[PDB]
Structure formats: C-alpha cells, structure tokens
Amino acid sequence: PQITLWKRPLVTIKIGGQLKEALLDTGADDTVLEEMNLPGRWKPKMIGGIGGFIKVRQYDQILIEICGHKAIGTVLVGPTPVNIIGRNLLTQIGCTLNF
Amino acid sequence: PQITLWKRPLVTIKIGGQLKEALLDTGADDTVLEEMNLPGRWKPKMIGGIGGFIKVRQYDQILIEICGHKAIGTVLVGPTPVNIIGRNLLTQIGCTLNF
Numbered sequence: 783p784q785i786t787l788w789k790r791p792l793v794t795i796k797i798g799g800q801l802k803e804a805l806l807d808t809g810a811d812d813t814v815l816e817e818m819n820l821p822g823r824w825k826p827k828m829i830g831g832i833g834g835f836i837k838v839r840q841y842d843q844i845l846i847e848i849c850g851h852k853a854i855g856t857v858l859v860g861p862t863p864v865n866i867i868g869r870n871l872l873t874q875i876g877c878t879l880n881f
Numbered sequence: 882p883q884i885t886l887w888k889r890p891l892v893t894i895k896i897g898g899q900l901k902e903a904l905l906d907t908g909a910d911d912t913v914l915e916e917m918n919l920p921g922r923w924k925p926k927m928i929g930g931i932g933g934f935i936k937v938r939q940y941d942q943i944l945i946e947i948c949g950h951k952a953i954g955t956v957l958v959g960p961t962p963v964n965i966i967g968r969n970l971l972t973q974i975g976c977t978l979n980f
C-alpha cells in the first residue's frame with residue numbers, strides 16, 4: 783500500500799503473539815519496541831537518539847508480521863516512547879520512499 | 882525518485898544559502914537540523930525523542946530545496962545528532978511510503 787505522510791505512518795504488527803501499532807520510520811536504522819517478552823534470548827545494548835541514550839535488550843532473528851508482510855531480523859526491546867519499524871525490517875518488506 | 886532503504890535515505894538540502902545533507906525521516910513530524918546560522922527571529926521550544934528532550938530554536942517560514950524540490954515550513958535548530966527532514970516538509974515535496 784501507498785502511505786501518505788500527512789499523518790503518522792502507523793501500521794499494525796504481529797510480534798510474539800501480540801498485536802501492536804508501530805511507526806514505519808525511515809529515519810531509524812534499528813527497530814525499537816516498548817517493553818515486551820520476545821522469546822529466544824538477548825544481549826545487553828545501548829542506543830542513542832534525540833535527547834540521549836537508552837538501554838535496550840537486543841533480540842536477534844525475531845519474526846514480525848508488519849501490516850501482513852512477514853520479516854525476521856534483529857529487534858531491540860527497551861523504553862522507547864513508541865514502537866519503531868527500522869530500516870533493518872523495512873528493507874525486507876520492500877518499503878520505499880517516493881517523491 | 883524511488884529510494885530503497887538498504888542504506889540511510891540521505892539527501893542534500895539547501896537552506897539559507899548553505900548546502901547540507903539531511904535524513905528523510907518519516908518518523909519525524911517536523912524538521913530538525915543541527916547547529917547552523919539561520920537568519921531571522923525564532924522562538925524557544927522543547928522536543929522529545931528516544932533519549933529524552935532537547936532545546937531547539939523554532940524558525941518559521943524557512944525555504945528549503947530538498948533534492949531540487951522547494952518547500953517552506955518550520956525548521957527546528959538544536960543538538961540533534963543528524964539532520965532530519967520531518968513530515969511537515971515531506972508532504973510538500975510529495976513523499977510517500979510504498980510497500
């Protein structure tokens with residue numbers, strides 16, 4: 783689907799048996815989601831953005847169905863104000879910017 | 882032009898007679914740029930991100946040519962790690978997400 787940018791590009795995702803809403807974010811290199819239990823194990827990690835840095839749990843080879851499109855990749859879990867679909871997963875579903 | 886997301890969607894922008902490189906960011910509602918000298922008055926403001934909040938200078942009605950497409954809108958100047966073109970300006974040049 784083509785998404786206009788007049789509103790926040792929010793999409794419905796399926797991850798770990800849970801339904802959430804995430805922002806298709808071309809400005810994010812990594813996918814970052816609010817707290818949840820993503821089975822499979824993890825390794826501590828720190829990521830930075832506007833305002834500073836946050837500590838996240840790096841989960842790898844994690845499945846996510848983004849708006850009906852399936853993808854597997856690294857998924858950072860931590861205190862993000864919001865869920866973010868990063869370029870690591872956007873490339874897998876064939877997302878592109880168009881102007 | 883169509884931009885794949887295998888790499889950062891970086892574009893060259895022209896603002897206030899200066900050439901810079903900015904990240905086409907669909908996750909941003911407004912445009913925020915690193916330190917620079919923007920002629921005009923401004924208004925203090927506070928904006929939030931993953932790591933917290935930063936203080937920026939709100940400049941209004943600022944012309945910016947993004948990849949040859951001209952647009953006018955608010956441009957926030959502050960301690961952002963990278964220049965980001967937000968949705969306030971992406972809509973003006975006709976940007977859309979396609980997957």
Ligand SMILES: CCC(CC)CN(C[C@@H](O)[C@H](Cc1cc(F)cc(F)c1)NC(=O)O[C@H]1CO[C@H]2OCC[C@H]21)S(=O)(=O)c1ccc2c(c1)CC[C@@H]2O
Binds near residue numbers: 814906907908911930
């Ligand atoms: C509410 C959604 C979201 C925040 C939860 C908004 N952000 C836009 C995201 O696209 C940012 C962009 C970025 C920010 C940055 F510091 C450095 C970068 F290189 C890139 N990505 C991000 O933090 O990404 C991180 C995860 O992946 C990693 O890769 C990039 C670095 C790491 S914002 O920049 O805070 C912002 C932009 C405009 C405006 C506001 C806030 C309010 C006022 C105005 O509307």
